[PDB]
Amino acid sequence: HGGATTVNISTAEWWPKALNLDILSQHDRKTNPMGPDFNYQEEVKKLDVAALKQDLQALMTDSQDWFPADWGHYGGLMIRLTWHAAGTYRIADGRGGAGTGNQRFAPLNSWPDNTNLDKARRLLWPIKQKYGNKLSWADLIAYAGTIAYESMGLKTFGFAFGREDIWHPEKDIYWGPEKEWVPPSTNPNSRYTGDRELENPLAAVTMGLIYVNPEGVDGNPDPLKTAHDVRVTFARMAMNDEETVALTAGGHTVGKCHGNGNAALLGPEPEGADVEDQGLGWINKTQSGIGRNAVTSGLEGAWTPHPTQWDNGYFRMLLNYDWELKKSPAGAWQWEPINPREEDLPVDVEDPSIRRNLVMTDADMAMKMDPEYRKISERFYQDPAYFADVFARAWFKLTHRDMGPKARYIGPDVPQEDLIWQDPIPAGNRNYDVQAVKDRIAASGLSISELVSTAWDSARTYRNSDKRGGANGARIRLAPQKDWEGNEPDRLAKVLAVLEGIAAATGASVADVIVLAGNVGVEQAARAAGVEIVLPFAPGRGDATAEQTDTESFAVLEPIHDGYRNWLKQDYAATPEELLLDRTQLLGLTAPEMTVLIGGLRVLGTNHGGTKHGVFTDREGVLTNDFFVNLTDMNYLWKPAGKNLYEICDRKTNQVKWTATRVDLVFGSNSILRAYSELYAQDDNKEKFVRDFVAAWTKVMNADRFD
Amino acid sequence: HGGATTVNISTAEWWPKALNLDILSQHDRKTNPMGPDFNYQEEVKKLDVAALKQDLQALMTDSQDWFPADWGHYGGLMIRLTWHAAGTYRIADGRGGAGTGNQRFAPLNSWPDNTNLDKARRLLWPIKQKYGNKLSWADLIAYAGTIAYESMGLKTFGFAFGREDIWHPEKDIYWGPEKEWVPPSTNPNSRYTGDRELENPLAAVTMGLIYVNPEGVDGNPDPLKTAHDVRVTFARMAMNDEETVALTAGGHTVGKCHGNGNAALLGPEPEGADVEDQGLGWINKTQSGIGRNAVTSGLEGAWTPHPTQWDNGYFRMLLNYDWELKKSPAGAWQWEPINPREEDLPVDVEDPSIRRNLVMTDADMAMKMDPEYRKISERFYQDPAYFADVFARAWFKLTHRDMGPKARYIGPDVPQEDLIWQDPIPAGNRNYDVQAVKDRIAASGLSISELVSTAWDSARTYRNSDKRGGANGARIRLAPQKDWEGNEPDRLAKVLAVLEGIAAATGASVADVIVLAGNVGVEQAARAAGVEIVLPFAPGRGDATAEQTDTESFAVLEPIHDGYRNWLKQDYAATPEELLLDRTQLLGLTAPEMTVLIGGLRVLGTNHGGTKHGVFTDREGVLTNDFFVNLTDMNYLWKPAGKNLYEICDRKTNQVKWTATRVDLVFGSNSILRAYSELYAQDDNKEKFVRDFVAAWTKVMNADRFD
Ligand code: HEB
Ligand code: HEB
């Protein structure tokens, strides 16, 4: 046969550095099986949430013969699922999280840490079958641990629904440079550089772990290094000290470690296992892997005397006893108590009249041994009421920190309360005379550059990874945002002065105006070209207050690179086009959209700094395919002027016609991008360019509109 | 930053064997930049072909300063472009060819053999700009060599238009196992196995060569090995001895080898070159690479005294002179004449008053030295008229062997003649009473299995790689097809007997009936389910005669594997699911379509051999999601029964409920496919399953309808 039917037969073997444009073309018609008028948001509403919880509760104690629930209670497992489902989230880029059901596809379905979560997912199947298209997996998975906590005795803070499902792995996510699973923090391709600093975009200490290692740093028990490790990793998943302790205690307040066997004797991870395993993994055909002779972490024992119940066991065991390293039966550093009481011994998973042992992971010990955590552990020990209130919030934050604003939240249990990390925003003045505001905007002595940049910049923060950022809420005017360099705070100030009063004058939100300012500016550059159109408009945006604005959090959204405005804050070690590709992907743009947006924003002179790189025109401020036209023109030759800069030179005359950056010239060099640049440079495609630029513009501006 | 912005950051690093489903999801909305009501077939019609040739002719002698035409004539280069554009085609799978404009994207844009074709493509740009959306690149490229031949003095047989463009590389194509360019025919990953046999699906002797090596087999001049090499490679691109000679002589009757420099001193291939090279490649910044001090093959000299003119020079030089190995200035085995005449010396590319040398490649020598080719070379020497008629056809076959049937051909120069390799088919009886034929079909004592298999099998031959195969022409009834095992010739015979007379009785083509037979059978299994529908229908199919049917050619289409009917002729070394993925891709099916088609065809008992593997039903012959339902059901466990077989067993009882093949179980193991199988197993999706199966069924049946 002659197809390329295995995954490694790619064009990525000869040119490994080459741009990964495939990440822009994800989740398209052909991969998606749903109809095209399908819409989950409206379909989920129709779901009998009441009945659903009837059945999740049901299941938690319906032990299946093919994978026996510890003590007749899957509660433990189901929480871990949801923990690990959410564990992947990182604040740098917002990627990862419970938000997509990413865990039922590779790579995550086969991470060491996600061991046996394959079973959990399958245990849920029959429910997802019963409820069908009204209950995505992403949601079902996010609920499972939450109902589990209820059934085990915790009042949880609430729940939303409305996480749409995907149908393949998120190609856009970079999980770390490692080549094998769980390596030491020094190998040829280690993610640690310098002062043992975890390179600045990742949240786990090694590949295929969720947050940290349980045997301690690099397999080497040390409660106080571990402590440090925990503090950074959780911080990068947006959790603070209080939250972190609360979560760890809260998790380990139920359930068990499983390591009562020989790890190596387990089958291959689910992506490695063969068709007979029903797409599960880590199956053990040699000996029994169910119930009691079962291995998962390699660690063995339960943190509490009653692991199917919510109680204070975790700090009671941790603070009362003294603890000491020992080795699981599978052979793993764990901590056990030095001569405890039989009463405190969790019993056996099959036969309740056999007492087994207790454990602590190195990360559990970090809670006692670290001076800062210790202070919090004490607080929850003698104030359980607080512990449970804190934890229930943190679990709910954990499981929703990536759904973005409350516009998208759905179903009966949604905290009516506004959390600061829901980046809240008022509703906007729905209706009023738009055309009037356009009128007054046009009046001001305000250039198309000024208009369009500001509008662009309010909008450019958005990212689908976790649905933060956007035009909406006009957080651009507020701190910390109005002082960011890339955001040009002088230009900004000036524009807002105008637009704030025009918005005051009109009772249309600064946001709506900031946007409409862009819109106008486009239409002006377009008309001046000769095609006159009205850009569409979505009024209704609120104006979020600085109280409801966690400024420390918003730093991860600072633009320190924006190709669309030829902005680069430093010289980074990633190429400035790789950088753009990242940005573009997070906006949710396609490759062609990315292509037009450059072409247009160049010739409208939106270039940050009043720089004129990639402004291939005499007709600056006028929406034309001029960029694409001179880019593709071989009357010119391109010369490096060092460092993200080139000179465009006439071949005959040798004079320099313009300058440009890698961001600009990537569209004339890359074969797929030059396909698009050639398209728009065609004589017959000036209307296409302009219709097209505008659709894309519009798309970006309505990026965060969940209404 | 945290995106996966370079190509090698994939899931294909941990599980290299894993199924490449990405090949099914190619050429989708997000990669495609055109509008959605765009349609090229109708848009090309509007093109001023007359003016186009005015300009191609124009260009052939408009030498550009940035890449100087040999003698003021690009003719040579432009032919080579089109040759190499078409060179990629292979008959095994139909993949490769001029048909898509695949050459302007990686990998082909950077093959060693395609060296400097990057310049050719760019030289054409301004024309493609001028004509815009009415002239795809795929067509423009296919024309360039054809107008070149005209302008140089050859009456070409004709031209079609209507090759749609792509916007990224055809991921489906496997070019060979090699890891470096042009290696020896023995390295760890060599494509040669056994008696130096080129493994049965590929048409070049090594990676990134078009057909064969010019320095001889493995760099080792031997006209008579080379000869053999040529004979097989060309045969695998569908050319016979007569055609092959004709083409080689015909090509080398104009143009030159360029090797007047230091090869190593050339820049990186276009995918390797940096943004400053304007997405060209092999640029030489150190010294001059234009005009005369120019390197391409490494060989140097011209095959004929007049290389810008069509003449008899090629055989005149080859047959009159005796020849001897020597070395280009770049250092390459070529053959030169032993003391020729100055008159016969092609002059210099810049200064016509300097005489240079002649060459022959080892493949040119193969024409003289091989006894069989020699006989043909003699024939063309003393009968130029014949040579040119033969060659013009072969060039036109070369450039159109992949466009499929003449339904798709467009524009003023199309040979009114029918060539046998256009797999011709009569027009069908457009209108007549369909419902009547349905009526009579239903009458016959003919099962849903019988109906649907036959209908499936007539249709299953189709492949988009080169648009051969399909329901149309009913070539299934004819030889060689009605004797293929997988095609079940008894069952077949029986059905046709019936359907032939029903078609005789009705004046609807056997093809239309064969299809409509399937259609009915579906509707019967569907109604019996309880959903009653009318499947759509495209009448109009002709019935091709066995005269207009090159039976040797049709062997490459024999189904020796069809998962959709659990058919496997042997035990191949590729996995039976990899095999399906290939088939599915060539049909043009998506992953979800692939998924339903299995689910349905199983339960309709279409399984080849009357086998019951993957027939998870009591209600055999009834269109239900039964397959998906029991597949996903964990009351069962799957046990290998050796060799593409498994037993589905009740966990409690240990009895065997059904059997199944890897093709069946791949949908319950693969994470992306089990996503789709779970979808269709949902309680709420029986109508979806059935609407969906039917759309897919329909798609397959109208696969070859270009009307
Ligand atoms: C929230 C929640 C949570 C959290 C946060 C956590 C956190 C954690 N964790 Fe966890 N875990 C958990 C919850 C949890 N957790 C659970 C539930 C479990 C168990 C369950 C069962 O039973 O399975 C665990 C389990 C577990 C285990 C065991 C596994 C088995 O099965 O065997 C381990 C090793 C761990 C570790 C860990 C670490 C290292 C950390 C850091 C911090 N953990
Ligand atoms: C048809 C057509 C054709 C064909 C078939 C061919 C076939 C061939 N071929 Fe060829 N070629 C050609 C056409 C051709 N051809 C041309 C046209 C040329 C050149 C052009 C120029 O001038 O560049 C060549 C060229 C050539 C060269 C040179 C390159 C440069 O530039 O330097 C070589 C080496 C060759 C080889 C060859 C071989 C080995 C073969 C096998 C067979 N090529």
Ligand SMILES: NNC(=O)c1ccncc1
């Ligand atoms: N390996 N882990 C288990 O088998 C399990 C854990 C928690 N509840 C039920 C089963």
Ligand SMILES: NNC(=O)c1ccncc1
């Ligand atoms: N390297 N080949 C050339 O430069 C060329 C060949 C044929 N016509 C024009 C230029």
Ligand code: NA
């Ligand atoms: Na995310």
Ligand code: NA
């Ligand atoms: Na407990």
Ligand code: NA
């Ligand atoms: Na092809």
Ligand code: NA
């Ligand atoms: Na000639």
